[PDB]
Amino acid sequence: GGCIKWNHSCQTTTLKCCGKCVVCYCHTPWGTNCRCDRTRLFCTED
């Protein structure tokens, strides 16, 4: 229940990652098992 946690699987579920600045990424050039292990560009966070 609730949003996807940091460096956890994005899981192809309707649920987004926790915090509007956090974003999903796959490390291989092709992939689907991607994780929320990055931030959107120009996020002014602390």
Coordinates of C-alpha atoms in Angstrom, one line a residue:
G1 CA 0.0 0.0 0.0
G2 CA 1.1 3.6 -0.8
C3 CA 3.9 4.9 -3.0
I4 CA 7.0 3.0 -4.2
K5 CA 10.1 3.4 -1.9
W6 CA 13.7 4.5 -2.8
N7 CA 15.7 2.0 -4.9
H8 CA 12.7 -0.4 -4.8
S9 CA 11.1 -2.0 -7.9
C10 CA 8.6 0.2 -9.9
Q11 CA 6.7 -3.1 -10.5
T12 CA 4.6 -1.9 -13.5
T13 CA 1.8 -1.1 -10.9
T14 CA -0.4 2.1 -11.2
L15 CA 1.4 3.4 -8.1
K16 CA 4.1 6.2 -8.5
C17 CA 7.3 6.5 -6.5
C18 CA 7.4 8.4 -3.1
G19 CA 8.0 12.2 -3.6
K20 CA 7.4 14.1 -6.9
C21 CA 11.2 14.5 -7.5
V22 CA 12.0 10.7 -7.5
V23 CA 12.0 8.8 -10.9
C24 CA 12.3 5.2 -12.3
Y25 CA 15.4 3.9 -14.2
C26 CA 16.8 0.6 -15.7
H27 CA 20.6 0.2 -15.7
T28 CA 20.8 -2.1 -18.7
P29 CA 20.2 -0.6 -22.3
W30 CA 17.0 -2.8 -22.5
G31 CA 15.0 -3.6 -19.4
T32 CA 11.6 -3.7 -17.5
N33 CA 12.6 -4.7 -13.9
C34 CA 13.4 -0.9 -13.3
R35 CA 13.9 0.8 -9.9
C36 CA 13.3 4.3 -8.4
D37 CA 17.1 5.0 -8.0
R38 CA 17.2 8.6 -9.6
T39 CA 15.8 12.1 -9.3
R40 CA 14.3 14.5 -12.0
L41 CA 16.7 17.2 -13.3
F42 CA 16.7 20.6 -11.5
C43 CA 15.1 19.3 -8.3
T44 CA 16.1 22.0 -5.7
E45 CA 15.6 19.6 -2.7
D46 CA 17.5 19.3 0.7

